[PDB]
Design a protein around this ligand. Structure first.
Ligand code: HEC
Length: 107
């Protein structure tokens, strides 16, 4: 779906997470270069065992399921959020993010 739209839905994400350039960790790990990266991999982030010992590897398909309801895919994770149980939204989320990658740029 669409990114311009998806930027809106990340608003409820930015509260704890960063993206783009000069993105530094916060209550949660920066979401730069998310797709492909290994779960609990970004450094300077005190991941939970649950997150980092999962072996997830964040592909669009598992994020799609995660975001829907976190506690169910990484049961016991530190991310206390009742997901994006909203299908239009999730798709645009996965458009905006995918757009940054690694150091916050376009690809
Ligand atoms: C504050 C309450 C948060 C909101 C709102 C969102 N996220 Fe989050 N996220 C938060 C924490 C504390 C953590 C760490 C979990 C742990 O157990 O260590 C996370 C983690 C993620 C991850 C995992 C990343 C990795 O490198 O493994 C992802 C993919 C993620 N968060 C995505 C995400 C998105 C897209 C959100 C908007 C809908 C979102 N989170 C909300 C804190 C918070």
């Amino acid at each position: 779906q669409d990114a311009a739209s998806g930027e809106q839905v990340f608003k409820q994400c930015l509260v704890c997470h960063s993206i783009g350039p000069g993105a530094k960790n916060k209550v949660g790990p920066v979401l730069n270069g998310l797709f492909g990266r290994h779960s609990g991999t970004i450094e300077g982030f005190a991941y939970s065992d649950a997150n980092k010992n999962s072996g997830i590897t964040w592909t669009e398909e598992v994020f799609r399921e995660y975001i829907r309801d976190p506690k169910a895919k990484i049961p016991g994770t530190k991310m206390i959020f009742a997901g994006v149980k909203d299908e239009q939204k999730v798709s645009d989320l996965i458009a905006y993010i995918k757009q940054f990658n690694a150091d916050g740029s376009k690809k």
